[PDB]
């Protein structure tokens, strides 16, 4: 009951920590002109410690728009929005939980913002073109734990309405 | 200056009304200079190619 809530609120929690450490750095690794990591904003090399932003999309129009998808890692950021807002929804149906259809459209929303980033990191895999970084593997977990907790919430759900129906019944 | 020439000069009709040439060794023509085609990225169409 509320220990799969608090499991599922902790699970959320530490999914968006894991999504801002997999946005911040160390998405990928890759040897440049020695080694270098990046975080899809910029690469950082192996003079030594400097960095800079060497996520330049220029140097069919499929490849082009393939290119302005994987500019800037819009669609990880759009899924990251997502799931902090619903995150939000869940926060808010935790406490005063007058409506029993909320629960739903947050856990939707959750499941697409989950699908999202994994188009997001299928996107990010598919810009890289020898080894990855800790961020790709971290994001990996994160959607892994998310798929998980969206399993929980709507066990809850499917739970609350069959409490629901024997009740009214 | 010279006495005789034996250099790529391109054999013109200007070029005969001073001097005088011989038959030409090596016959030529105007080409196309393109690069060698390396594997290009295929893409979406490869779910239907």
Same mark, same amino acid.
């Given at each position: 009951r509320g220990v799969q809530m608090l499991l599922t609120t902790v699970g959320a929690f530490a999914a968006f920590s894991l999504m801002t450490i997999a946005v911040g750095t160390d998405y990928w690794l890759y040897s440049r002109?020695?080694? &270098? %990591?990046? @975080?899809?904003?910029? &690469?950082?090399?192996?003079?030594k410690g400097l960095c800079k932003q060497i996520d330049h999309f220029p140097e069919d129009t499929a490849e082009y728009f393939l290119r302005a998808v994987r500019a800037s890692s819009i669609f990880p950021i759009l899924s990251v929005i997502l799931?902090?807002?619903?995150?939000?929804?869940? +926060?808010a149906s935790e406490f005063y939980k007058t409506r029993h259809n909320?629960?739903?459209?947050?856990?939707? =929303? =959750?499941?697409? +913002?989950?699908?999202?980033?994994?188009? @997001?990191?299928?996107?990010?895999?598919?810009?890289?073109?020898?080894?990855? @970084?800790?961020?790709?593997? =971290?994001?990996?977990?994160? =959607?892994?734990?998310?798929?998980?907790?969206?399993?929980?919430?709507? %066990?809850?759900?499917?739970?609350? %309405?069959?409490?629901?129906?024997?009740? +009214?019944? | 200056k010279a006495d005789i020439a034996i250099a790529?000069?391109?054999?013109?009709?200007?070029?005969?009304?001073?001097?005088?040439? $011989?038959?030409?060794?090596? $016959?030529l023509g105007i080409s196309i200079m393109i690069k060698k085609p390396q594997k290009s990225k295929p893409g979406v169409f490869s779910f239907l190619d």
């Open positions: 002109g020695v080694m &270098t %990591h990046s @975080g899809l904003w910029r &690469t950082c090399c192996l003079f799931l902090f807002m619903g995150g939000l929804c869940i +926060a909320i629960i739903l459209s947050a856990g939707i =929303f =959750f499941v697409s +913002a989950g699908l999202s980033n994994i188009i @997001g990191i299928i996107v990010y895999i598919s810009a890289n073109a020898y080894s990855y @970084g800790w961020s790709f593997y =971290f994001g990996a977990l994160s =959607f892994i734990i998310a798929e998980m907790v969206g399993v929980l919430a709507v %066990h809850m759900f499917i739970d609350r %309405h069959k409490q629901l129906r024997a009740t +009214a019944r | 790529p000069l391109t054999i013109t009709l200007v070029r005969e009304e001073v001097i005088d040439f $011989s038959k030409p060794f090596m $016959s």
